[PDB]
């Protein structure tokens, strides 16, 4: 009696598909043929942040757009002052296999995680003068891929046990768990209104979740391989997904399908990091081909290449005022661009 | 809050960062891989939901980090990129269990032909040799059923520096090594070389074999960077 629920599952899977082809009335490449292009965005390396030992796997900007934390697999975080190339803090970790990093939007806390399967929150505003571990959030089976703060007492952790989880830093336990994926959930981006978040996994599927309810509102099934990087549009109604089939893909929530395909025939390497600008016009994507590219999000034309790194770009982040782009890679150096 | 005292804190951090670069460069990192049947959980005992196990040991005043990755899911195509630029991969294979030896050859094929473990050399520890000696001296389980080409294999001449045994266990154990170097010599480049060894339950020389092989791994990493190849 499994096929009675398997043939009804394929019937709703095509009823989803004919409900999307009815809405696919005009390509975004048709509405954006008469819109002017961007031009050759030629950025320059303004700062270079030296001091990490091993490869950098994650960075995150702060909301002041001046401080940033960077995670390296020598086993420590460094909070940088971007205008000075100073080191505000250097926090040694318990594990040496950190894969995610998150600066809290208040500025008081910072998070990391990795193959230890723990999200470790760090208090930076202690009266003792040193950075101490505030909470050590255990409960995931697989490795931690992405953590993102919502406020000072809640965090959303993506892991490779096919689950995402919303935590509580004071209590230390899971508020709700998100259990829809069938693969290692690799990336995670919150909405600007912090009410929804998307999560891209290794089943070539992005899923839009609700934080309060704990459901999966929409699923997005366009990619051909493992989605490594996800990023919300600044208005909260679209998102871009980077995957290992050398394709970025902009989706949308109100239409529930794919919009554009930022692919190129020369590019075979996969995408490790993806990010939008402040206006949502540029889609900066980091590649395994040692260099980041600046796609234009409405025309899908490569309008710039950032080519300063001598290894795999694994981190990318645009500030909250859109001033700079920081780009961390496996050559132990970050680079801040304008 | 003067900026001159902020850059003095930054140059007190870089002094601490330089003295943890010297510990880091003098420390060799390893990666244990192997199934649950193998004695990977026992070599860490013979040496001196948490998802990673570090095991530090020193031999001849040289520090070694092992990383017995556990508490993970089944698929490893994503976190195996983290262990790129590691010194070696200790791969432990249970040479006694005949029926599950082909999947030990299949996941050794995945390690050796991975895109990120292209430069990394594998130290095979063909474990449980005393359990292999008692299996062909009993003669019950046969290798010819699980592998059809054991009936047409003979022992090579310049081999077997063992004290005492019959060549049934030698033609057995040198064929298991031969199947694991059919993968290292055919589908691999000259950037990384396998190192087969035969290890047992209580064998205290397993930390010396790692030290001798890692000394050879760094020697070809130095012969290539000094352009003497």
């Amino acid at each position, epitope marked *: 009696e499994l096929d009675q629920l398997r043939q009804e599952a394929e019937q709703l899977k095509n009823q989803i598909r004919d409900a999307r082809k009815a809405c696919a009335d005009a390509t975004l490449s048709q509405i954006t043929n008469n819109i002017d292009p961007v031009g050759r965005i030629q950025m320059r390396t303004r700062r270079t942040l030296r001091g990490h030992l091993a490869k950098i796997y994650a960075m995150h900007w702060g909301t002041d757009s001046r401080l940033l934390v960077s995670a390296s697999q020598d086993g420590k975080l460094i909070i940088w002052d971007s205008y000075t190339t100073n080191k505000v803090h250097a926090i040694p970790l318990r594990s040496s296999w950190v894969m995610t990093c998150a600066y809290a939007p208040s500025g008081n806390y910072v998070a990391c995680g990795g193959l230890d399967n723990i999200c470790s929150i760090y208090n930076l505003k202690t009266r003792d*003068g040193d950075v101490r571990v505030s909470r050590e959030l255990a409960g995931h089976t697989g490795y931690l891929s992405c953590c993102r703060f919502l406020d000072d007492n809640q965090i959303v952790t993506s892991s490779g046990d096919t689950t995402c989880a919303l935590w509580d830093i004071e209590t230390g336990q899971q508020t709700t768990t998100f259990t829809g994926h069938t693969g290692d959930v690799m990336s995670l981006s919150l909405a600007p209104d912090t009410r929804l978040f998307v999560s891209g996994a290794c089943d070539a599927s992005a899923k839009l979740w609700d934080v309060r309810e704990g459901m999966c509102r929409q699923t997005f099934t366009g990619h051909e391989s493992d989605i490594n990087a996800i990023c919300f549009f600044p208005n909260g109604n679209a998102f871009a997904t980077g995957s290992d089939d050398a394709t970025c893909r902009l989706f949308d929530l109100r239409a529930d399908q794919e919009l554009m395909t930022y692919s190129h025939d020369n590019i075979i390497c996969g995408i490790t990091s993806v990010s939008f600008s402040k206006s949502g016009r540029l889609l900066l994507a980091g590649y395994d081909d040692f260099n980041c590219n600046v796609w234009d999000a409405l025309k899908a034309d490569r309008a710039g290449v950032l080519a300063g790194h001598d290894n795999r770009v694994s981190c990318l982040g645009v500030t909250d005022d859109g001033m700079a782009v920081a780009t961390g890679s496996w050559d132990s150096f970050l680079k801040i661009w304008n | 809050a003067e*900026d*001159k005292a902020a850059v*003095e*804190r930054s140059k*007190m951090i870089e002094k601490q960062l330089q003295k943890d670069k010297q510990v880091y460069r003098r420390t060799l990192r390893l990666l244990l891989l192997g199934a649950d049947n193998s004695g990977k959980s026992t070599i860490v005992k013979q040496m001196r939901t948490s998802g990673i196990f570090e095991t530090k040991f020193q031999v001849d005043k040289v520090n070694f980090h092992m990383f017995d990755v556990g508490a993970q899911r089944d698929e490893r195509r994503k976190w195996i990129q983290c262990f790129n630029d590691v010194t070696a991969i200790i791969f432990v294979v249970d040479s006694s269990d005949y029926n599950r030896l082909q999947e030990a050859l299949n996941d050794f094929d995945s390690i050796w032909n991975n895109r990120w473990l292209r430069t990394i050399s594998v130290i095979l520890f063909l474990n449980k040799q005393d359990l292999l000696a008692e299996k062909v001296l009993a003669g019950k389980s046969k290798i010819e059923d699980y592998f059809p080409e054991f009936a047409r294999y003979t022992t090579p001449e310049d081999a077997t520096p063992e004290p005492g045994e019959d060549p049934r266990v030698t033609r057995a154990k040198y064929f298991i090594r031969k199947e694991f170097v059919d993968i290292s010599t055919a589908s691999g480049d000259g950037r990384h070389i396998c190192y087969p060894h035969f290890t047992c339950a209580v064998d205290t020389e397993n930390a010396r074999r790692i030290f001798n092989d890692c000394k050879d791994i760094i020697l070809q990493m130095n012969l290539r960077e000094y352009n003497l190849v």
Partner: single-chain antibody, 231 residues
């Protein structure tokens, strides 16, 4: 956190006396610690400074040569060795910690003080030396400087303080606008490039003391005479 000092007593004017402050409760080796003294029935006056790691060591010109500051990061102590003790060095010697990074709050914790009785610079002038207050009003303590404290990086470097009667000074506002941690939201300090203010919006009985000021642009850290409130 705690900073307790030891030393003092009657010293002959040609004599010597070594003070010592024992830090216990914080990471002492990461804090640049100062020495600030207070003559009897007078204001505060800066004496010495030693940085985090015994790097930049700065003295005032009135104690230069005679006074040597030192540090012992394992045993968590801070010393002040005086060689020839002139009679104007009669004071109560406070020991202040100060950490320096982006967003830090220096001069945030002060010691209790030891009484040592012996028997160019940016002048800060607080005009009113006594303000009569009642609990409930909204007062404003003014402050003026010689040079403008607005540096080119973007933030002015004025530091407000409060010394309650009997106690040790505590930091209220750092960098002229930022409320310190532990201070209530009534203290809304603001100001301009050379004219400053500290508005206490609703006064309580704990707000009675001598409100000082400080600059941190040039390293002789000159204080004010102190606006004293009384109820």
């Amino acid at each position: 956190v705690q900073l307790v000092e030891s030393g003092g007593g009657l010293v002959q004017p040609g004599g010597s006396r070594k003070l010592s402050c024992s830090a216990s409760g914080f990471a002492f080796s990461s804090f640049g610690m100062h020495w600030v003294r207070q003559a009897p029935e007078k204001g505060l006056e800066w004496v010495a400074y030693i940085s985090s790691g015994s790097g930049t060591i700065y003295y005032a010109d009135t104690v230069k040569g005679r006074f040597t500051i030192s540090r012992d990061d394992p045993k968590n102590t801070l010393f002040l060795q005086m060689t020839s003790l002139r009679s104007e060095d009669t004071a109560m010697y406070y020991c202040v910690r100060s950490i320096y990074y982006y967003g830090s709050s220096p001069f945030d914790f002060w010691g209790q003080g030891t009484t040592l009785t012996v028997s160019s610079d940016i002048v800060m002038t607080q005009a009113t030396s006594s303000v009569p207050v009642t609990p409930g009003e909204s007062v404003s303590i003014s402050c003026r400087s010689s040079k403008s404290l607005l540096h080119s990086n973007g933030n002015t470097y004025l530091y407000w303080f409060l010394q309650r009667p009997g106690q040790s000074p505590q930091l209220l506002i750092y960098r002229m606008s930022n409320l310190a941690s532990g201070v209530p939201d009534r203290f809304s300090g603001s100001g301009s490039g050379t004219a400053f203010t500290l508005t206490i919006s609703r006064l309580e009985a704990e707000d009675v003391g001598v409100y000082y000021c400080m600059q941190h642009l040039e390293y002789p850290l000159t204080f004010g005479a102190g606006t004293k409130l009384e109820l």
